[PDB]
Design an enzyme around this catalytic site. Structure first.
Site, short mmCIF file in Angstrom:
data_model
loop_
_atom_site.label_atom_id
_atom_site.label_comp_id
_atom_site.label_asym_id
_atom_site.label_seq_id
_atom_site.Cartn_x
_atom_site.Cartn_y
_atom_site.Cartn_z
N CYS A 1 1.08 4.03 2.84
CA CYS A 1 1.52 3.34 4.14
C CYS A 1 3.24 3.77 4.17
O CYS A 1 3.70 3.83 5.17
CB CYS A 1 1.35 1.86 4.45
N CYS B 1 0.67 -1.06 -0.07
CA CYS B 1 -0.03 0.04 0.20
C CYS B 1 0.95 1.43 0.01
O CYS B 1 1.56 1.53 1.12
CB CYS B 1 -0.88 0.04 1.25
#
Length: 106
Positions: free
Chosen positions: A35, A32
Protein backbone atom coordinates in the site's frame (compact mmCIF):
# COMPACT_ATOMS: atom_id res chain seq x y z
CA UNK A 1 -6.64 15.61 -3.62
CA UNK A 2 -7.05 12.07 -2.17
CA UNK A 3 -9.98 12.12 0.23
CA UNK A 4 -10.07 9.53 2.99
CA UNK A 5 -13.64 8.54 3.96
CA UNK A 6 -14.72 8.33 7.61
CA UNK A 7 -17.58 5.84 7.38
CA UNK A 8 -20.25 4.28 5.17
CA UNK A 9 -22.08 7.60 5.39
CA UNK A 10 -19.12 9.71 4.29
CA UNK A 11 -18.52 7.19 1.50
CA UNK A 12 -22.10 6.99 0.22
CA UNK A 13 -22.39 10.76 0.15
CA UNK A 14 -19.16 10.90 -1.83
CA UNK A 15 -20.36 8.41 -4.46
CA UNK A 16 -23.59 10.35 -4.93
CA UNK A 17 -21.72 13.65 -5.15
CA UNK A 18 -19.26 12.14 -7.63
CA UNK A 19 -21.62 12.91 -10.53
CA UNK A 20 -20.30 11.28 -13.71
CA UNK A 21 -16.64 10.89 -12.71
CA UNK A 22 -14.66 7.68 -12.34
CA UNK A 23 -14.44 6.74 -8.67
CA UNK A 24 -11.49 4.81 -7.38
CA UNK A 25 -11.77 3.19 -3.98
CA UNK A 26 -8.42 2.46 -2.43
CA UNK A 27 -8.77 -0.09 0.39
CA UNK A 28 -5.57 0.10 2.39
CA UNK A 29 -3.92 -0.45 5.76
CA UNK A 30 -1.10 1.62 7.28
CA UNK A 31 0.88 -1.53 8.18
CA UNK A 32 0.81 -3.00 4.68
CA UNK A 33 3.96 -2.64 2.60
CA UNK A 34 2.38 -2.84 -0.91
CA UNK A 35 0.00 0.00 0.00
CA UNK A 36 2.83 2.39 0.85
CA UNK A 37 4.55 1.55 -2.45
CA UNK A 38 1.58 2.36 -4.70
CA UNK A 39 0.59 5.60 -2.93
CA UNK A 40 2.96 7.83 -4.97
CA UNK A 41 1.39 6.62 -8.23
CA UNK A 42 -2.07 7.26 -6.78
CA UNK A 43 -1.26 10.92 -5.99
CA UNK A 44 0.24 11.37 -9.47
CA UNK A 45 -2.82 9.95 -11.28
CA UNK A 46 -5.15 11.79 -8.94
CA UNK A 47 -3.43 15.08 -9.82
CA UNK A 48 -3.14 14.40 -13.53
CA UNK A 49 -6.85 13.56 -13.95
CA UNK A 50 -8.16 15.93 -11.27
CA UNK A 51 -11.41 16.54 -13.17
CA UNK A 52 -12.37 13.08 -14.42
CA UNK A 53 -11.37 10.96 -11.42
CA UNK A 54 -11.96 11.02 -7.67
CA UNK A 55 -9.89 8.82 -5.39
CA UNK A 56 -11.33 7.62 -2.08
CA UNK A 57 -8.94 6.11 0.44
CA UNK A 58 -10.60 3.63 2.84
CA UNK A 59 -8.59 2.57 5.91
CA UNK A 60 -9.92 -0.96 6.48
CA UNK A 61 -8.86 -0.82 10.16
CA UNK A 62 -11.12 2.22 10.72
CA UNK A 63 -13.98 1.29 8.38
CA UNK A 64 -14.38 -2.43 9.18
CA UNK A 65 -18.02 -2.30 8.06
CA UNK A 66 -17.07 -0.99 4.61
CA UNK A 67 -14.12 -3.39 4.25
CA UNK A 68 -16.53 -6.15 5.24
CA UNK A 69 -19.21 -4.98 2.81
CA UNK A 70 -16.77 -5.12 -0.11
CA UNK A 71 -15.36 -8.40 1.18
CA UNK A 72 -11.75 -7.22 1.30
CA UNK A 73 -9.01 -9.76 2.02
CA UNK A 74 -5.91 -8.39 0.22
CA UNK A 75 -4.17 -5.01 0.50
CA UNK A 76 -4.36 -2.95 -1.49
CA UNK A 77 -7.64 -3.58 -3.32
CA UNK A 78 -8.98 -1.13 -5.89
CA UNK A 79 -12.66 -0.93 -6.78
CA UNK A 80 -13.59 1.19 -9.79
CA UNK A 81 -17.02 2.78 -9.94
CA UNK A 82 -18.57 4.83 -12.70
CA UNK A 83 -22.21 5.95 -12.46
CA UNK A 84 -23.01 3.48 -9.69
CA UNK A 85 -21.68 0.55 -11.72
CA UNK A 86 -18.59 -1.38 -10.65
CA UNK A 87 -16.52 -1.29 -13.84
CA UNK A 88 -13.47 -3.07 -12.44
CA UNK A 89 -11.78 -4.49 -9.34
CA UNK A 90 -8.40 -6.08 -8.57
CA UNK A 91 -6.05 -6.47 -5.60
CA UNK A 92 -2.35 -5.60 -5.45
CA UNK A 93 0.02 -2.69 -5.99
CA UNK A 94 0.20 -3.01 -9.77
CA UNK A 95 0.95 0.59 -10.77
CA UNK A 96 0.65 -0.28 -14.46
CA UNK A 97 -2.79 -1.90 -14.25
CA UNK A 98 -3.99 0.95 -12.04
CA UNK A 99 -3.10 3.52 -14.69
CA UNK A 100 -4.54 1.42 -17.54
CA UNK A 101 -7.89 1.06 -15.79
CA UNK A 102 -8.07 4.77 -15.05
CA UNK A 103 -7.28 5.74 -18.64
CA UNK A 104 -9.71 3.12 -19.96
CA UNK A 105 -12.71 4.44 -18.02
CA UNK A 106 -12.40 8.23 -17.97
Amino acid sequence: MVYQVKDKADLDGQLTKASGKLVVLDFFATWCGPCKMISPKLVELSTQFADNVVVLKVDVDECEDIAMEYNISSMPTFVFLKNGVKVEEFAGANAKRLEDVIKANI
